[PDB]
């Protein structure tokens, strides 16, 4: 049996809220670069359309809600997320102090069309803020990413 309430849908929507400006159920191949441009790394025009082909639901570059995360959910353990534990630390760390604040984080995601501000989101850091610096430490990565 499978059940998804407002708790499992918000974490499933949290990923769709970035690649979709209004959340119509389908995202453009151009939004990926909008998230990658936020990740700091973003590929060329055709190199980004190749990311939707990994699942090829419509083979047009557009993808639905249950179709994008499916081929991407099996690719988390189909590689090595340990080498990745340091990457999210290398990406998020703007000043390289060991803690990344949410104040800059959502202003960062805001270039996509967020309904949340870089400031008001900081109420969220409290979920991964184990060091209490109002930012995320190196200790929260292994807890949230390794222990899902």
């Amino acid at each position: 049996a499978d059940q998804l309430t407002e708790e499992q849908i918000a974490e499933f929507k949290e990923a769709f809220s970035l690649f979709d400006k209004d959340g119509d159920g389908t995202i453009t191949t151009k939004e990926l670069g909008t998230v990658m441009r936020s990740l700091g790394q973003n590929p060329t025009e055709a190199e980004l359309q190749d990311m939707i082909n990994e699942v090829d639901a419509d083979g047009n570059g557009t993808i639905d809600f249950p179709e994008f995360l499916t081929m991407m959910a099996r690719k988390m353990k189909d590689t090595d997320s340990e080498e990745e534990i340091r990457e999210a630390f290398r990406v998020f760390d703007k000043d390289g102090n060991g803690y990344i604040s949410a104040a800059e984080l959502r202003h960062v995601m805001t270039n996509l069309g967020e309904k949340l501000t870089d400031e008001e989101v900081d109420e969220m850091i409290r979920e991964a803020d184990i060091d209490g610096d109002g930012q995320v430490n190196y200790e929260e990565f292994v807890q949230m990413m390794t222990a899902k």
Binding site: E14, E84, F92, E127
Partner: peptide, 17 residues
């Protein structure tokens, strides 16, 4: 993945492609 854990993991999946 719940609120800020999923937003962090989404960054991990967008780079492993």
């Amino acid at each position: 993945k719940k609120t800020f854990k999923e937003v962090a993991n989404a960054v991990k999946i967008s780079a492993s492609l």
